[PDB]
Protein backbone atom coordinates (compact mmCIF):
# COMPACT_ATOMS: atom_id res chain seq x y z
CA UNK A 1 0.00 0.00 0.00
CA UNK A 2 -0.41 3.04 -1.45
CA UNK A 3 1.27 3.32 -4.91
CA UNK A 4 1.25 7.18 -4.93
CA UNK A 5 2.03 9.44 -1.96
CA UNK A 6 0.61 12.67 -3.37
CA UNK A 7 -3.10 12.01 -3.60
CA UNK A 8 -2.86 8.72 -1.67
CA UNK A 9 -4.88 6.89 -4.24
CA UNK A 10 -7.95 8.87 -3.11
CA UNK A 11 -9.88 8.48 -6.35
CA UNK A 12 -12.07 11.38 -5.16
CA UNK A 13 -9.12 13.76 -5.38
CA UNK A 14 -7.18 14.78 -8.49
CA UNK A 15 -3.56 14.02 -9.14
CA UNK A 16 -1.19 15.29 -11.81
CA UNK A 17 1.58 13.12 -10.48
CA UNK A 18 -0.12 9.72 -10.75
CA UNK A 19 -3.04 10.64 -13.07
CA UNK A 20 -3.42 12.94 -16.07
CA UNK A 21 -0.62 15.43 -15.52
CA UNK A 22 -2.78 18.24 -16.92
CA UNK A 23 -6.33 17.73 -15.59
CA UNK A 24 -5.23 15.32 -12.92
CA UNK A 25 -8.25 13.19 -13.73
CA UNK A 26 -8.08 9.41 -13.61
CA UNK A 27 -10.54 8.55 -16.45
CA UNK A 28 -9.77 6.92 -19.78
CA UNK A 29 -6.42 5.07 -19.30
CA UNK A 30 -6.71 3.72 -22.80
CA UNK A 31 -6.54 7.42 -23.74
CA UNK A 32 -3.55 8.33 -21.55
CA UNK A 33 0.04 8.72 -22.71
CA UNK A 34 3.16 8.07 -20.69
CA UNK A 35 6.06 10.28 -21.62
CA UNK A 36 8.99 7.80 -21.77
CA UNK A 37 11.36 10.44 -20.36
CA UNK A 38 9.01 12.26 -17.92
CA UNK A 39 6.94 9.25 -17.06
CA UNK A 40 3.85 11.33 -16.12
CA UNK A 41 0.61 10.54 -17.93
CA UNK A 42 -1.45 12.65 -20.37
CA UNK A 43 -5.01 12.51 -21.71
CA UNK A 44 -4.59 12.68 -25.49
CA UNK A 45 -7.42 15.24 -25.36
CA UNK A 46 -5.84 17.39 -22.70
CA UNK A 47 -2.81 17.90 -24.94
CA UNK A 48 -2.21 20.86 -27.15
CA UNK A 49 -2.80 20.30 -29.74
CA UNK A 50 -5.15 17.49 -28.58
CA UNK A 51 -4.92 14.17 -30.45
CA UNK A 52 -7.98 12.56 -32.15
CA UNK A 53 -6.46 9.28 -31.25
CA UNK A 54 -3.45 7.64 -29.71
CA UNK A 55 -0.20 7.70 -31.70
CA UNK A 56 0.93 4.49 -33.34
CA UNK A 57 4.59 5.49 -32.86
CA UNK A 58 4.40 3.57 -29.57
CA UNK A 59 7.19 5.75 -28.04
CA UNK A 60 5.70 9.12 -27.01
CA UNK A 61 7.31 12.21 -25.43
CA UNK A 62 5.41 14.83 -23.45
CA UNK A 63 5.32 18.63 -24.17
CA UNK A 64 7.31 19.08 -20.99
CA UNK A 65 10.04 17.18 -22.94
Binding site for Zn ion (CB under 5 A): 4, 6-7, 15, 17-18, 20, 22-23, 35, 38, 43, 46, 62, 64-65
Phi and psi at residue 20, to the nearest 5°? -60, 120
* Least distance CB 56 / Zn ion (angstroms): 19
Q: Which is nearer to Zn ion, 4 or 54 (CB)?
A: 4
CA distances from 33 to 1, 2, 23, 45 (A): 24, 22, 13, 10
CB 25 within 8 Å of CB 43: yes
Q: Which is nearer to Zn ion, 29 or 64 (CB)?
A: 64
* In the complex, residue closest to Zn ion by CB: 38
Amino acid sequence: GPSCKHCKDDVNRLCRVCACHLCGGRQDPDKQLMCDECDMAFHIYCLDPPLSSVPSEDEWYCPEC
